[PDB]
Each structure stands twice: as C-alpha cells, then as structure tokens.
Amino acid sequence: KIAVPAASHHFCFSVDLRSVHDLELSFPVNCILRYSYPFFGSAAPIMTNPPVEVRKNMEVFLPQSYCAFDFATMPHQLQDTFLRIPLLVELWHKDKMSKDLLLGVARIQLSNILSSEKTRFLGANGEQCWRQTYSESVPVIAAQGSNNRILDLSYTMTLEDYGLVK
C-alpha cells in the first residue's frame, strides 16, 4: 500500500537501560523504567519488567532493559530529531496495594551517539552498513520539584544504518 521515499534509510536504534545506582531517596523504590519515543514508530510505552527493589548504595541491573527499533527515515531527519527531541526515561515506583508513582525523569540526549566513531559492518547481502555506540551514566531528576538528582541511570545505545530501504 504505502511507500516511503526512496532516499530513506533503514536504521536500527537500540537502548539498553542497563542499571540504576546511587539512589538518594531514604525509602526503597520498587523500580521500573518507562519511555516513549514515537520517532521510532509507535507511541506505545516500553518498560522494564518486573519491578526491582532499589535501595541506597547499590547498582541494580534492570530486567527486560533492552529494546531494538527498526525504522525508515532520512539521515537529515534522524539528525534533527536526535538533536532536538530528548529521550525521556521515567522512573516509576510500583506496588500491588498502591497506585503507580512517577518519581523522576532522566533526559537522554540521543545526538550524543552521532559524534561517536562510525564502524563498518556487512548486512545479510554483503551491503555496506555502519554502527555507532554510546554509553554513559545520567541523572534521574525528581518529577514534581526540580534539579533534585534522585538516582543515576547507566545505559547504552546503538545506531545501525543499513543503507537505503529495499
């Protein structure tokens, strides 16, 4: 039915929300991380699962922390969107008896990946593909007030360019 412009590339972007650490709240958080980035194709939220308890002075590795997104767009458009639209990763507290609580948000600057080294790889038909990867730890800032670092998020992202869409 519906085509895309021939100059579109097939990209694969993946986010690994690997761990959280340095909880600065005095109480235990039953943590999930949740995000939406409709540029990748859907506003449907992605979240870690199940919840994991986080207390002070520990690194907790998140389950179901990895997601890869295959999408088609123009290189120019990916550049502008990654420069202008931050990836907002929400820290939620979950409990069986209580309603879900939003504690804070990490703002991930996707364009950090664009300055990383581009490395070559080959696609499933020997075509020239490129990969960039970037890793850092970023602050989760409290949801209601401002500038209050409540947790750190260690993540990795990868961007693969499979070249022109087929």
Residue numbers in the entry: 447 to 612
Question: What is written in the article reporting this PDB entry?
Answer:
While the linker between C2A and C2B is short, the linker between C2B and C2C is ∼100 residues long and enriched with proline and charged residues but largely non-conserved and without predicted secondary structure elements. Our structures revealed neither complexed Ca2+ nor potential Ca2+-coordinating top loop residues or cationic β-grooves. Prime candidates for interaction interfaces in these domains are the regions defined by strands 3 and 4 at the edges of their β sandwich that constitute their most conserved parts.
